[PDB]
Ligand SMILES: O=C(CN1Cc2ccc(Cl)cc2[C@H](C(=O)Nc2cncc3ccccc23)C1)NC1CC1
């Protein structure tokens with residue numbers, strides 16, 4: 017029993033965190049094999065980079081100084097070729113995630129991991145994270161068996177306190193650029209498929225007060241959801257919720273009729289899984305993994 | 313900016329997780345140096361759980377009855393002893409990944425990270441607090457027994473909890489690493505229930521100071537309160553009594569924001585009376601109590617917004 021926001025074990029990622037210093041700027045880097053990946057703002061980026069030599073970049077892995085032997089740029093990410101391969105390099109892939117997908121964040125300062133937390137890529141491409149100055153280069157990841165899938169690298173904080181960053185190939189999530197300008201996060205929406213998954217997790221944990229005898233159509237549900245700034249629910253979302261629907265005996269459009277009633281009437285002093293708000297940072301797969309016991 | 317429930321990086325603890333099998337039971341163990349620590353109920357059948365005599369069950373076992381697995385490698389048990397509700401298995405190999413560590417017993421209200429495991433394999437990490445009723449609201453399934461709670465302040469791992477059982481309400485009970493249970497619980501399948509839980513007042517206050525640090529003051533008022541009057545109101549909402557120690561502990565956060573502890577206590581009184589009226593505090597519609605004054609100072613900036 018119990019339902020917590022759970023992050024993946026961070027150990028395989030801790031063994032890759034390094035400190036990168038270029039002049040007066042100090043941020044975090046990801047050391048995989050003989051390459052260190054970090055935000056390019058550590059340094060017209062081609063004009064700034066052409067003026068630098070390998071020794072201008074100071075890379076620290078624990079107490080050991082790594083020697084930079086080459087450097088190149090890929091989108092908004094700087095790739096520093098080092099003389100030593102990381103002996104703690106795990107099996108890994110670079111993956112780009114979609115909004116609504118969740119991931120673990122290992123928050124670092126001066127190449128030292130300080131905390132781990134779980135979060136989701138919002139529909140507006142921002143992440144509601146917890147980062148202070150020096151956190152740049154902290155990474156987001158998922159684990160599938162023994163393989164680490166790197167999906168995010170922190171670049172900046174927006175004026176509303178939310179965060180923006182890139183995939184590990186330097187491509188930003190959202191319409192953001194890596195520089196000081198007037199940029200704001202778009203209006204956010206609720207990840208509907210995630211709220212439904214969390215309602216199924218509540219039923220699995222013995223919370224059924226919100227269930228009713230009604231069912232609805234996908235069209236009618238989307239007309240109501242659009243009015244409460246909820247993401248449209250697609251047929252793919254309904255298919256993805258199939259296993260949870262079969263496990264609890266509550267059809268997806270049966271659970272949508274419960275969500276519609278919670279949206280129009282509220283919770284009325286009651287909570288779901290200890291929460292007074294409808295939770296959207298647990299995907300269908302997270303619910304199945306936390307209520308099954310998948311290990312790494 | 314931002315305020316998340318943050319767990320400590322789990323790597324130092326992952327390198328200590330092993331699988332312990334005794335007969336038909338399989339649970340998790342903590343391998344530190346040449347000793348593997350695990351719940352003593354690993355020597356029990358489901359039948360034994362009603363009235364188990366652990367001394368009688370243990371005297372009938374030999375070293376080769378305990379199977380310990382560290383990854384793909386089988387560890388050989390060379391000794392065994394019981395310390396309260398934990399079984400200590402002496403192994404022939406010291407753990408090369410043993411970090412710097414201490415065994416610490418925590419008090420209710422204290423927080424810690426939990427590395428949830430099954431078959432000696434870590435599957436997830438989360439942050440939680442020791443409730444005033446000595447239970448933990450965790451997320452554990454069958455096979456999680458032996459999963460551990462810890463803090464990693466500086467480079468040292470402080471082990472404070474080992475999971476032993478789930479109570480009928482879905483909450484969890486366990487011991488410190490010396491086998492002493494937190495709360496009036498026994499590793500016996502007995503009619504035992506968690507006492508009425510209360511809100512950790514000093515933690516809610518700390519979290520209200522964290523909201524003021526991150527720029528939110530809508531909940532503040534012009535009133536103050538005596539400590540006694542605050543506790544008379546707090547007891548009516550099932551909040552833990554706030555002691556003079558709690559007020560002293562909140563000293564640095566009070567000095568950083570310019571809001572006296574008893575003035576923040578007055579805001580808490582008013583929040584309990586009125587609710588949030590459609591507003592949230594740090595993205596929450598409920599008053600949060602699983603962040604200590606020490607966690608707030610650790611996570612939040614030193615400069616107030
Ligand atoms: O199904 C049982 C059998 N349990 C009896 C029992 C009695 C005393 C002691 Cl110390 C341990 C135990 C085990 C125990 O409580 N294990 C577990 C731990 N953590 C989370 C769980 C989640 C689901 C199932 C078992 C869990 C086995 N009871 C549980 C109340 C559902």
Ligand SMILES: [Cl-]
Pocket residue numbers: 417418419422
């Ligand atoms: Cl303590």
